[PDB]
Design a protein around this ligand. Structure first.
Ligand SMILES: Nc1ncnc2c1ncn2[C@@H]1C[C@@H](O)[C@@H](COP(=O)(O)O)O1
Ligand SMILES: Nc1ncnc2c1ncn2[C@@H]1C[C@@H](O)[C@@H](COP(=O)(O)O)O1
Ligand SMILES: Nc1ncnc2c1ncn2[C@@H]1C[C@@H](O)[C@@H](COP(=O)(O)O)O1
Ligand SMILES: Nc1ccnc(=O)[nH]1
Ligand SMILES: Nc1ccnc(=O)[nH]1
Ligand SMILES: Nc1ccnc(=O)[nH]1
Lengths: 519, 519, 519, 48
């Protein structure tokens, strides 16, 4: 239960702050079509003339899925502000899902005149793959998430997946999943669906920027008790003579003092400028791109290793594929102008992580001697070395929240490369589909496959509640900190607001790293 | 109860393995038309010019029936694999039926424009003939079973039956059953129907192949203590002279050692080749066919006695009507090409059962003496002889499960000749029908039969749960066994999968005999 | 325990009669060699030029096995007499096995002078395959059983088995068993092995002959109330005219009276005479032999269906392969003279079973009419028909006791065709082997297979106790019955006795059918 | 144990059924045990 003329759920949609806790609960109203005419279909790069690196094999499903894996699905711009401006970190604790006031309509089109009526007896099916038995497509930054603006109605994305492929063909080990082979709950107007999940223990997300840097971590007023080789050729003597002179760590030469740690790992990336003139005249997008080679296919590393987007005084350049880029509502599908996208800046970590477009360092390459000169080389790729420390890619008000850690034998610091929390057991995929309704069948039994169905779609609200744990700050810093603030200068439109046509717009990407914390 | 806007059942459809048990529960969504305009109709071969062997008399009913008598209605291809690759046998224990979310629509066609609306007050009737008072039509391999692929919608078959006939006429002892003369439950959207049955004690199905053969069952290293007549004419003596020389069972002559058992019974069948050239140029399909003669009418024995489909090294031939043949989805109604069907191979039993196209053996036909020579003959038909042992026809992922043992005075090893379990009291026939809805009647009483009805059909889901009992294996075999495995070699489509158009396809027939067990 | 100088078992070997019970317990002393040098070896008809029907594939094992599957292993001639002369039937109930006083000797041969010494620390391994996981070779009438005469020392047979074969090659489904992969108990002089088994419920063996025959089972003094068609052509009328005259069952014509039952099933066999002159001059041994065809290979049916060895007054002929034949101690391996074997006579069942060399009967083959004459044919092979009754092949003092019913889907009256009790779970195979003893190994590690071993054999006593259940007789017969009796007439040697050289000899084969019982 | 919701059959290690002179992982006519090929453990499927 209960009934047809009885709401099966209310509009819960608030935000509650409780010291070290904050419950965000937002509800949006959705629309679900009938996909593929209730058919599972094999799909492939086959006959697309697709590049060799773009081949793929998989299946498109008749099911739709719920996806709220974006911060703006839960935090209003103002809340996000509250969060990033006063806390050193946060993480998800537990969540709550709910489907209600579901209504199934049946459209009868004819003579251009289409009519929409209720089919009070139709059902919609749901089920959460809580045992992760289906391929996981959440956490690949796809569209179809809950809209940022509560007053927006959205369309549920269609669920499709991929599997092992050799060119545009499949292989023996390829897998095909049928979602109807999963116990799922059926609903009619008066029914509703609910379910709760608990997040696994996960590190707080570092919502702060360091107020010191690895190199500048010593006492500016005092020497060290350590010495380093300072000269191998004596100064003057009106001749250049071989020697071995040592000096001891001085504040006057911090760049040469023995230290305890190393910058973060790094996989260098090409650098491009926001002013076309500076760029080389060619299309190096794929040519000079940092790609990884997985079984014959190349794939751009994007955004790849967390690295400072640019060195100080140069928010002019950016890693060719080392920064998150969101599109403004104006941006088109492909080859859209620069001012139609928003490129994130990850320079807040230049204090501990290597800059993405530069060399990580220099390495000795030979054995110097009186007869052969000491040579070196530039290291462009650097794996994990003991003593390394680093910061992970920051998250954004419109970025991903989590991603499922692949189920592999081993894995290194599994933090989703494009921002987020790495979960061994993430929130499960919620699958929904309209059950088929056979149109009038022949008056004489026919065994051939049924392919005539009442055309219909469904609609209802969905509520998602998440309890977040805050990590308050207690900086003993004396001077004011940086804080996200809307510009007070007058203008035609207000940031994160609708316009004269009712189109909600997210002007810029907001990070979370404003508050300071020493190393 | 309960209501209109309230689902009366969920989509249970899983599979659970519990050591020696396995519960398969699958649910499909169905569509039921109005058959015969709610009329019972007499039907016969009368005026069809039908052959003499094809005459028949019976009645077609306004009712529809549920039929899930095919393994693929319960086992997914993968499950079937699990089953056949690790168990020596299995059998049904108990089942559970359920009808729900039933919806009755009423189509109003006009001007080519047809409209489908709900008739919230209409009813559908169901009832299980649990006392087997109606002619049993399940277990005759008819279409209309639950689809293999869960996502398929199917049409319920129409229930018709036959009775005693003399040509195209009926006889005094002929029977006519009216299904409305059975207490049946009526349902409206909010209602549902449920019922459970328990299988009778039945032998496990032999899901294994023998790793020895009747003839080769002795100790290869040792003689016997028995002797046999070896020669009746002395060897050499530069003359051929009468004699009586005996030898004793030696490994050097196993084909002549006294044994304890005999191969299985046999009723020889003609042999045809898959390469037309080898075949005789004529249409012997019926001509040289093995037929039985029951009261003036002939009927092909098909598949008849369980016999090896061909001797070793010849999966090229096959019994003309001694093997199960399923059609690929491409196969047509009649006279379709070879590669549109799939012919089962029953050679796994050549170890104990006679080959179907050969003679069972040789028999002495006279009394030899010095004056008359010892003659013999080929035995083509062999009834049960004491000491006989045999294997029954294997079952297939897309074959029958059970059949009702006819209610006759006697019966021999009643295992359904075309595969399956012989049940004295099988799952009952589930009958369903849409109750008639008189269209507007005349405004003045008329006693003549009512023949104007609201045109309508119904639809809903049906769930069938079966608990199967497994007979695990404990072979002390040392070397690996054969196992059903999908080919790993790359290809365009995956076996037992949908294609680019959403058409599910069962590439080959899967048996159950892979594991080995000695005699 | 216990010790080296301590007997681990006594010589139990008696026979006890207890009304309806009789416990036979006999013990013999055995000798076990080292077979195959402790090696498992693949063996086949490969490269033997062996006939096509004699091909085979299998493995010879390093193990030996105990076999007491012959009546004379438990019954002395006198006991057998007691049994067959006073009981209407008997069957096995439970048994007891025991291995003791085992001694392992190690032979050191050299310069023709061989020396035998005790290896007090060597072990012998035993184990009963009580789960029937190994191919069963008992019940194939092989040599190596316990000797009839208690004072005889015997050699344990070597255990080998066969498996699926295609010519002299193997197949995928072929099985290879390693006996070392079975938990087995190890023994040194002071140890012993014991185990008990219980026979399954089985019909008593019919140790009697019928004192009536199927045809002559009515009242000689009274008519029947039934009539039969006696003439179809009127007698006399000085003309032969069509008619229909009926008579009623009279004692004067028993051969034509309606009856209730039919003789036993039958598969005709060629007939040969003990006096070569009567026989046809040719070698029809295989030519005109009744053979069965199992997957390309032919095999003589021997002894096949239980049938009377010859009609009354003709103990001169015999079925070419329808009677058991034991060899006298003088008989050679092959092509030995008639008087070196003993051919059993199964004429005691001519009262209910068909004679083996004759036709079972006559059958109508056409539809007679004034224009076409009534023809018939001789039926040489007859399967089981309802109403059939029959007697099984008798057992002999030196014949088999039981056989394992093959593990097949179905089987008909599974009584071992060559005499005995058909057991689903027979006494298990007892396997014994001398554990290898590495000779001195190289002084420097070598991974190659070890192939140098101390040459040794073992010896000890084995006791087998079986409790048999008797079925006493209570015939109300007035005249004396036939009884097995040794001839009283004087002669040079006593039957079932040793001769001047100490060679025990079993003069003739003794059946069990002497006592009478009406149908 | 595995609980793949996969629908199509998986790959499985299986001895070849085609006839031949010797059986895999078996002794020969001389009693020499032989391991014909190396068997891995990766046959069953599991999504990432
Ligand atoms: N930023 C981060 N750094 C390290 N680990 C993180 C992380 N975010 C999430 N994790 C994961 C969550 C858990 O999966 C844990 C790894 O668990 P396991 O893979 O060894 O079974 O750390
Ligand atoms: N493979 C099989 N072999 C023998 N019997 C089988 C069988 N499969 C099913 N049966 C039946 C099931 C039960 O009907 C039983 C026969 O019962 P009744 O007809 O004497 O009353 O054996
Ligand atoms: N002379 C005989 N006649 C009939 N059956 C006999 C027999 N001697 C032994 N049996 C077997 C012993 C048991 O195996 C029983 C058959 O058991 P199941 O094969 O149906 O499981 O009858
Ligand atoms: N960081 C890690 C250390 C060891 N093993 C892993 O899988 N990951
Ligand atoms: N196998 C059978 C034996 C006896 N009667 C039967 O009806 N069936
Ligand atoms: N005698 C028999 C009747 C029915 N089934 C059998 O296997 N055997």
């Amino acid at each position: 239960a209960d009934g047809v003329g009885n709401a099966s759920g209310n509009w819960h949609c608030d935000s509650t702050w409780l010291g070290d806790r904050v419950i965000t609960t937002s509800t949006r109203t959705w629309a679900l079509p009938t996909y593929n005419n209730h058919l599972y279909k094999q799909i492939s790069s086959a006959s697309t003339g697709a590049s060799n690196d773009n081949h793929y094999f998989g299946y498109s499903t008749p099911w739709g899925y719920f996806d709220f894996n974006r911060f703006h699905c839960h935090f209003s711009p103002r809340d996000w502000q509250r969060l990033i401006n006063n806390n050193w970190g946060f993480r998800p604790k537990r969540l709550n899902f709910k489907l209600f006031n579901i209504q199934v309509k049946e459209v009868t089109t004819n003579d251009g005149v289409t009519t929409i009526a209720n089919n009070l007896t139709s059902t919609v099916q749901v089920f959460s793959d809580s045992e992760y038995q289906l391929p996981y497509v959440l956490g690949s930054a796809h569209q179809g998430c809950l809209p940022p603006f509560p007053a927006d109605v959205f369309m549920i994305p269609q669920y499709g997946y991929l599997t092992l492929n050799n060119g545009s063909q499949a292989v023996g080990r390829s897998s095909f999943y049928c979602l109807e082979y999963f116990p799922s709950q059926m609903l009619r107007t008066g029914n509703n669906f609910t379910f709760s999940y608990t997040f696994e223990d996960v590190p707080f997300h570092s919502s702060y920027a360091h107020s010191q840097s690895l190199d500048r971590l010593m006492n500016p007023l005092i020497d060290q008790y350590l010495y380093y080789l300072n000269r191998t050729q004596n100064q003057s003597g009106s001749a250049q003579n071989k020697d071995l002179l040592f000096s001891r760590g001085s504040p006057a030469g911090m760049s040469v003092q023995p230290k305890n740690w190393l910058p973060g790992p790094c996989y260098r990336q090409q650098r491009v400028s926001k002013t076309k003139t500076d760029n080389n005249n060619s299309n190096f997008t794929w040519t000079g791109a940092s790609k990884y080679n997985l079984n014959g296919r190349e794939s751009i590393i994007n955004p790849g290793t967390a690295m400072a987007s640019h060195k100080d005084d140069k928010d002019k350049f950016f890693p060719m594929s080392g920064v998150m880029i969101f599109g403004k509502e104006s941006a088109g599908a492909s080859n859209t102008a620069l001012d139609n996208v928003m490129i994130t800046d990850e320079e807040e970590i230049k204090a501990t992580n290597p800059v993405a477009t530069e060399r990580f360092g220099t390495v000795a390459v030979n054995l110097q001697s009186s007869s052969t000169d000491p040579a070196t080389g530039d290291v462009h790729v650097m794996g994990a070395l003991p003593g390394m420390v680093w910061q992970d890619r920051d998250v954004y008000l419109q970025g991903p929240i989590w991603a499922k850690i692949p189920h592999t034998d081993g894995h290194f610091h599994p933090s989703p490369l494009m921002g987020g929390f790495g979960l061994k057991h993430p929130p499960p995929q919620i699958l929904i589909k309209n059950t088929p309704v056979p149109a009038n069948p022949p008056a004489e039994f026919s065994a051939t496959k049924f392919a005539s169905f009442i055309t219909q779609y469904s609609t209802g609200q969905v509520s998602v509640e998440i309890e977040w744990e805050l990590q308050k700050e207690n900086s003993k810093r004396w001077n004011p900190e940086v804080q996200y603030t809307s510009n007070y200068a007058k203008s035609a439109n207000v940031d994160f607001t609708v316009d004269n046509n009712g189109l909600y717009t997210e002007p810029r990407p907001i990070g979370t790293r404003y508050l300071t914390r020493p190393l």
